[PDB]
Amino acid sequence: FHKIRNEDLIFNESLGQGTFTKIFKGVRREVGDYGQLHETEVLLKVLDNYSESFFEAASMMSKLSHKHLVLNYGVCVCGDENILVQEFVKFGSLDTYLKKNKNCINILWKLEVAKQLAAAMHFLEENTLIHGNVCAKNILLIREEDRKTGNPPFIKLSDPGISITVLPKDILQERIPWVPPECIENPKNLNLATDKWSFGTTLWEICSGGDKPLSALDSQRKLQFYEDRHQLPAPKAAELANLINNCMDYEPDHRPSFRAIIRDLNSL
C-alpha cells in the first residue's frame, strides 16, 4: 500500500464502528495529477494486534482493480494507530440505506443491486480470491437510482476486514448466519464456497428492508439453528427466495457458481 503521512490527514466525524475498528470521515491533502493540490474526502478505518489481518485482506483485494470493488488510497502507519485510507462513497452502507428507504425500493432496484454484487463475486471467483465478509453493511452505494435518467443504482464491495480465521469464536457466533455452517465448525474451512453462502444471506438482507436475519436469536440459539439445518424464512418480497436457499446450501460443493447465479438472475 501507498504510505500516507499523519500530517496530511484531518479526522472529522465518527461514522460508526466495525469489528475492532472505528470509522471516521476525513480529508486528505495530496498532490494529484498534473501536480495539482487537492483536499479529498476520505474514509478512515482505524484499528483500535489484529492489524496484520485487516491490512493483508484489504491489500490482496486492492491488487485487483474492478469497477465494483472499493478503492483504497493507502495506509497511515504513523504514530500509535493503524489507519486505512479509503475512497469516501457518497451514500454509505447498503443496510442502513435499505432501512431508511424501505418504502421506496422495488424488485427492479433489488435485482440490479443483486446482479452487480454477483458481477463482483464472479470476478473474485475467477481470480480465486475469497472475501469472507459479504453482507449488506459491506455494500457501498456509489449513486442512487434516477428513474428520470433511467440510470440504475451503482454499488461497490468494501474490504474484507479481519479474517474469520483469527477472530474470537464469540464474534464468529454473532455473525451467524453470514458465516457459513462449515466455518462455525472450523474457521479454517474458509473457501470460495464460503462467499456463496454469505451472498445468499446478503440477498436476504437486500429483500428485507434492513432487517438482520436471526437477530432475535442469541448466540446459543444461532448455533442451534445451524445444528438443526434450518434455512432463513422467505422474505415477504419472495422473488429471490429460491436463489437465497440455493446459495445457502449446507453442502458447500452444491452451492452454484456465480456464472450460474448470474444466469439465474438474468432469467427474471
Ligand X SMILES: Nc1nc(Nc2ccc(S(N)(=O)=O)cc2)nn1C(=O)Nc1ccc(-c2nc(C(=O)O)co2)cc1
Which residues are at the interface with ligand X (CB under 6 A)?
15, 18-19, 21, 23, 43, 70, 86-89, 92-93, 96, 137-138, 140, 158, 161
User: In the bound complex, what is the minimum distance in angstroms from residue 156's beta carbon to ligand X?
Assistant: 8
Q: What are phi and psi for residue 45, nearest 5 degrees? A: -115, 120
User: In the bound complex, what is the minimum distance in angstroms from residue 43's beta carbon to ligand X?
Assistant: 4
- In 144-185 the beta strands, taken as DSSP E runs, fall at 154-157
User: In the bound complex, what is the minimum distance in angstroms from residue 261's beta carbon to ligand X?
Assistant: 22
> Contact 84/54 with Cβ under 8 angstroms?
yes
Q: What is the SS3 assignment for 16?
A: strand
CA 24, CA 42: separation in Å to the nearest integer? 9
> Contact 23/17 with Cβ under 8 angstroms?
yes
Q: What are phi and psi for residue 217, nearest 5 degrees? A: -95, 125
User: In the bound complex, what is the minimum distance in angstroms from residue 70's beta carbon to ligand X?
Assistant: 6
User: In the bound complex, what is the minimum distance in angstroms from residue 114's beta carbon to ligand X?
Assistant: 19
> Contact 130/192 with Cβ under 8 angstroms?
yes
Q: What is the SS3 assignment for 46?
A: strand
Q: Report how far apart, in Å, the C-alpha atoms of 53 and of each of 59, 164, 167, 207, 239 are.
A: 10, 10, 10, 31, 37
Residue in the structure block whose three cell numbers are 429460491: 242
Residue 180 or 243 with smaller CB distance to ligand X? 180
C-alpha cell at 25: 470521515
Residue 44 or 265 with smaller CB distance to ligand X? 44
Residue 160 or 235 with smaller CB distance to ligand X? 160
User: In the bound complex, what is the minimum distance in angstroms from residue 42's beta carbon to ligand X?
Assistant: 8
Residue 28 or 265 with smaller CB distance to ligand X? 28
Residue 43 or 75 with smaller CB distance to ligand X? 43
Q: What is the SS3 assignment for 76?
A: strand
Task: Report the length, in residues, of the chain.
Answer: 268
